Symmetry: C4
Subunit: 80 residues, 4 copies
């Protein structure tokens, strides 16, 4: 990534690896090591993502929001 990965990776049901970067992105990486998508936050992602039972990816940023991201990489909502 463009920054330190302090974020601890979370693993989807299909083996997708979700991890925050200090570069401000949440990364979705396929088991093959190819980018699936990256989600632009406003701040460093030191928070380790969590995966809901419907596959939703939750993670906090230094931009003060908790992000809920759809498995396809589109914002579901952000909580300030």
């Amino acid at each position: 990534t463009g920054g330190s990965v302090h974020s601890s990776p979370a693993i989807g049901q299909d083996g997708t690896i979700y991890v925050g970067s200090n570069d401000h992105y949440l990364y979705a990486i396929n088991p093959n090591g190819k980018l699936k998508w990256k989600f632009e936050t406003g701040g460093s992602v030191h928070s380790s993502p969590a995966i809901g039972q419907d596959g939703t990816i939750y993670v906090g940023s230094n931009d003060h929001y908790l992000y809920a991201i759809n498995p396809n990489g589109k914002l579901k909502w952000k909580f300030e």
Copy 2:
């Protein structure tokens, strides 16, 4: 939240998202992105919550206590 979310979210059995803020709150957020409740601690919550088998939410604060919070957002106990 009112602060950085370094806290890694934990997910309840019903999909509730629990996460600490540097603003001193533990947040319970519904899958829909609406606040369920927030619990006021004395310090930054960098600790990532854990969920007991009875649904109890455990998390540490920079105020030096480990908090046990009922799913309804009321204090069960704090350990100094």
Copy 3:
């Protein structure tokens, strides 16, 4: 505890809460909020404990060791 809890709590099979303190202890706390035991390390425990399938508690210290602690609070081994 005697310090900040940056350590994220881990939950045993019986509901025991394991958490590191910057005070240098790993704490085992019963679901009732009473101390079960505390294990003295040489350094801050920022590491979040993990629980093996046999109930062994693993956690790192700023004293440079990974600790394996028996459920009864006695050292199994430490890896430098």
Copy 4:
């Protein structure tokens, strides 16, 4: 290890303990406390490893890469 263990240990299906060190290694430790292997990264491993369903070990370094490591300690891939 040669450094602080801020990395939270992850546990394999066979009970293998995976943990990052600030010394730049990911360590695989047998339940008996003997080194299985250590994987050399370019930076501090503060990230807590995660284990895929095929046993792959994922972890980020301060060297900016997310590492995918085979259970036998050989690099599968790294994502910058």
